[PDB]
Amino acid sequence: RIVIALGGNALGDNPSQQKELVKIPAAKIAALIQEGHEVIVGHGNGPQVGMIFNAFADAKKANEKTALVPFAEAGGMSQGYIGYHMLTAISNELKKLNIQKDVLYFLTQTIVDANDPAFKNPTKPVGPFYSNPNSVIVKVVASPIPVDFIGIDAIKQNVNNGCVCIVGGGGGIPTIIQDNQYIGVDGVIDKDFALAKIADAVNADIFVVLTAVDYVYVDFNKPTQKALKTVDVKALNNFINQDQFAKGSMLPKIKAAMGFVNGHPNRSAIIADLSKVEDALKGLSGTKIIA
Amino acid sequence: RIVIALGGNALGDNPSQQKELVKIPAAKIAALIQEGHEVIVGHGNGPQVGMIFNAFADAKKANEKTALVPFAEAGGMSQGYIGYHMLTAISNELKKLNIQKDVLYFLTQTIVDANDPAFKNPTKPVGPFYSNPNSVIVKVVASPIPVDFIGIDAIKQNVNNGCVCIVGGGGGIPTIIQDNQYIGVDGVIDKDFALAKIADAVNADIFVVLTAVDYVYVDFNKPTQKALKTVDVKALNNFINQDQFAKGSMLPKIKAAMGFVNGHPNRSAIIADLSKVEDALKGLSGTKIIA
Question: Domains of chain A (ranges plus CATH)?
Answer without folding.
Answer: 1-291 (3.40.1160.10)
